[PDB]
Amino acid sequence: SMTKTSVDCTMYICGDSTECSNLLLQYGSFCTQLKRALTGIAVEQDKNT
């Protein structure tokens, strides 16, 4: 198994800036699918073990 990892879009891309966070919504469903992929990877690691 690997190390289960999780990524926060707002903290990574925009940090603590509010304006960047507001502008981030315009790009759509990127973060949803990124988090879905990472969650699937983590559940897969647990299933492997």
């Binding site: 926060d8 707002t10 903290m11 988090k35 969650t39």
Partner: protein, 39 residues
């Protein structure tokens, strides 16, 4: 918290589980200058 999940999954019924709804950020809460020589 039930609805913040219902709203995220775009569904009105949820099945037993752990789902990541969002994130919890704690939001934000002597050499004196010689004026005495002039004034």
């Amino acid at each position: 918290p039930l609805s913040e999940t219902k709203c995220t999954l775009k569904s009105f019924t949820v099945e037993k589980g752990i789902y990541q709804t969002s994130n919890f950020r704690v939001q934000p809460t002597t050499n004196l200058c010689p004026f005495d020589e002039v004034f």
